Design a protein around this ligand. Structure first.
Ligand SMILES: CC(C)(COP(=O)(O)OP(=O)(O)OC[C@H]1O[C@@H](n2cnc3c(N)ncnc32)[C@H](O)[C@@H]1OP(=O)(O)O)[C@@H](O)C(=O)NCCC(=O)NCCS
Ligand SMILES: CC(C)(COP(=O)(O)OP(=O)(O)OC[C@H]1O[C@@H](n2cnc3c(N)ncnc32)[C@H](O)[C@@H]1OP(=O)(O)O)[C@@H](O)C(=O)NCCC(=O)NCCS
Ligand SMILES: CC(C)(COP(=O)(O)OP(=O)(O)OC[C@H]1O[C@@H](n2cnc3c(N)ncnc32)[C@H](O)[C@@H]1OP(=O)(O)O)[C@@H](O)C(=O)NCCC(=O)NCCS
Ligand SMILES: Cc1cn([C@H]2C[C@H](O)[C@@H](COP(=O)(O)OP(=O)(O)O)O2)c(=O)[nH]c1=O
Ligand SMILES: Cc1cn([C@H]2C[C@H](O)[C@@H](COP(=O)(O)OP(=O)(O)O)O2)c(=O)[nH]c1=O
Ligand SMILES: Cc1cn([C@H]2C[C@H](O)[C@@H](COP(=O)(O)OP(=O)(O)O)O2)c(=O)[nH]c1=O
Ligand SMILES: [Cl-]
Lengths: 186, 186, 187
């Protein structure tokens, strides 16, 4: 079979805005859809979680198990950005240093949250099993390899790997031509 | 909207025990509820799996996709200990050496199950995508980085990172004061 | 427990399927008509099977494991098991910047990497691991946890790392044990 909402059920969800050809699995979780926005030709697979301010452009695959903890400051993805399975992107994290208490259970005034908008520029691919922390921009046409971790903004058009990531080599810009060629025949 | 049980439904699950202000997603999986006790101010998110022997104290977040398999020896977590998304704590793990058959499709004679209780002491924080193997004491105040793997027990108030983890710096103890400051005003 | 009844299962429509095959109701099966399962097989909560998967016998597919069979398929031999939160890909999008990617985009603009994934006998894949397309995991190999595998792996070794490196011989005791269990089945 397949797991997706129909254009009908989509509409009843109460999204800030949702495009056309949007396939979201009923096996995903959508928290606070009133601030979640989806452009066109998007797919979100089983067991993803979207919570808080999330904005996705058009022609993005969010693969299974991927969590987007958009918070109040948000996560945004430009067009042709894609995220492989089991990725987490965080717009807000707790403070591990030992200088604060943490998580939901604890009153704000004792915490020390790290928070910043997270943006994923065009043509970003995020490898399977990766993590992106708050306040970072992943640069235009960056690929980040599998099982990688990102704590900082990434320079455009490079491939990064590792925990935390290191720049391994350039990203081909050939996606750009194709983007245009594809867009042409629309 | 949230996916959590009403206190009504909670009790019709029947845990060895279960405190108050305890939010557990309906999208989580609780097996063997009668071997799980749960304190107060505790939250378990979508897609988690609790299995068998699990003891959770008070003031704890267990983030989504987290699996606690406590089989018979169990997992025990103190107060103010937290677990980030997508972690596994294993109280029992198969012998990988070549010397044994494995998993639930096989009789136990042909198996060499390494088992051993897992404890996470006050203020432990496990970061996301982490694994804890059996027979491990995560000392009080220990922070383990995201995408870390833990085989040995670990020293109080330190920060560990890697696969397998290694010690990289002392955790601050100021959270001691804040615990106090905080329980103080109740 | 989570599993489908024997009645519930023959209702899914698996190409083939055997007996004592416990499958969680919280796992996701896609195109069951191209998925054969042997006997004594466990698939836990939140797994995803999609496309050509063949699984033999005495196998555990731990919680959260995704097997993306595609056309080419993923094949496991008997006594192979996979641990929680693993991903097996028989197809994957070229990352180089030489092509677009995803089901959002028409086939011509992509440069999809494809190939059979075979998990031979006694294979054990550790937890949180990723295995790529066109990859033969050799007989009685163990890959550790959090491991990444992009090329074929030689018989009877332990492998760890991202990407994997060979670390030690895996012991073959397991083969005698196998025989002993199989005989104890007969007499
Ligand atoms: C990052 C990636 C694209 C690089 O592939 P590549 O161009 O073949 O690069 P190579 O395999 O030659 O390796 C280059 C270096 O990076 C390392 N490396 C490659 N992938 C890595 C990863 N995910 N994490 C850490 N290191 C990695 C290799 O060790 C090698 O190291 P060295 O330079 O010290 O020898 C690929 O390894 C990858 O991670 N793909 C993820 C696939 C995915 O997530 N798919 C989801 C479904 S579509
Ligand atoms: C543990 C952590 C807090 C430490 O970061 P930090 O205090 O800023 O210290 P640094 O980032 O300078 O890291 C120190 C070193 O460890 C390495 N390192 C840091 N985090 C690592 C990790 N998770 N795994 C492997 N290595 C890590 C870095 O390469 C650096 O190496 P070096 O000693 O060769 O320079 C952070 O990196 C981390 O892993 N956080 C997890 C957060 C999380 O899981 N959040 C879930 C949402 S609440
Ligand atoms: C693969 C495994 C069995 C190897 O364990 P081992 O035989 O105890 O080997 P050791 O602990 O001596 O370590 C061998 C080396 O590999 C490294 N290593 C071990 N496991 C690793 C892993 N998963 N990833 C990366 N490196 C690893 C160690 O740092 C050590 O390094 P060195 O030789 O360079 O000093 C074990 O490490 C493991 O990962 N088991 C996974 C368990 C699991 O996934 N279980 C599912 C539950 S049923
Ligand atoms: C992975 C996945 C697939 N499916 C369905 C829709 C897809 O068209 C079909 C198989 O697609 P998929 O498994 O993503 O492979 P492909 O790359 O060929 O699209 O199964 C879901 O409904 N939900 C899911 O989470
Ligand atoms: C992640 C998650 C959120 N929610 C709901 C309940 C929470 O009150 C709300 C906020 O979730 P969350 O994303 O954890 O935000 P915060 O970090 O501010 O708590 O979303 C669930 O019900 N289940 C979940 O698994
Ligand atoms: C982990 C898990 C357990 N269960 C059920 C079946 C088991 O009888 C019981 C305990 O499971 P588990 O912790 O897997 O025990 P074992 O090590 O014996 O396999 O809970 C599921 O249905 N699905 C799951 O994903
Ligand atoms: Cl997961």
């Amino acid at each position: 079979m397949n797991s997706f909402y129909s254009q009908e059920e989509l509409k009843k969800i109460g999204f800030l805005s949702v495009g056309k050809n949007v396939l979201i699995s009923k096996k995903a979780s959508i928290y606070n859809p009133g601030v979640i926005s989806i452009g066109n030709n998007v797919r979100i697979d089983d067991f993803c979680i979207l919570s808080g301010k999330v904005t996705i452009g058009s022609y993005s695959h969010i693969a299974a198990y991927t969590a987007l903890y958009g918070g109040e400051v948000g996560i945004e993805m430009y067009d042709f950005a894609n995220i492989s399975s089991r990725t987490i992107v965080y717009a807000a994290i707790a403070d591990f240093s030992g200088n604060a208490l943490m998580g939901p259970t604890i009153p704000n005034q004792y915490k020390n949250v790290k928070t910043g908008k997270v943006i994923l520029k065009k043509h970003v691919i995020i490898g399977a099993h990766s993590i992106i922390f708050p306040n970072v921009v992943i640069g235009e046409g960056v690929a980040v390899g599998a099982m990688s971790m990102v704590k900082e903004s990434l320079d455009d058009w490079y491939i990064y790997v590792g925990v935390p990531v290191r720049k391994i080599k350039a990203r081909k810009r050939k996606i750009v031509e194709l983007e245009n060629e594809f867009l042409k025949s629309m």
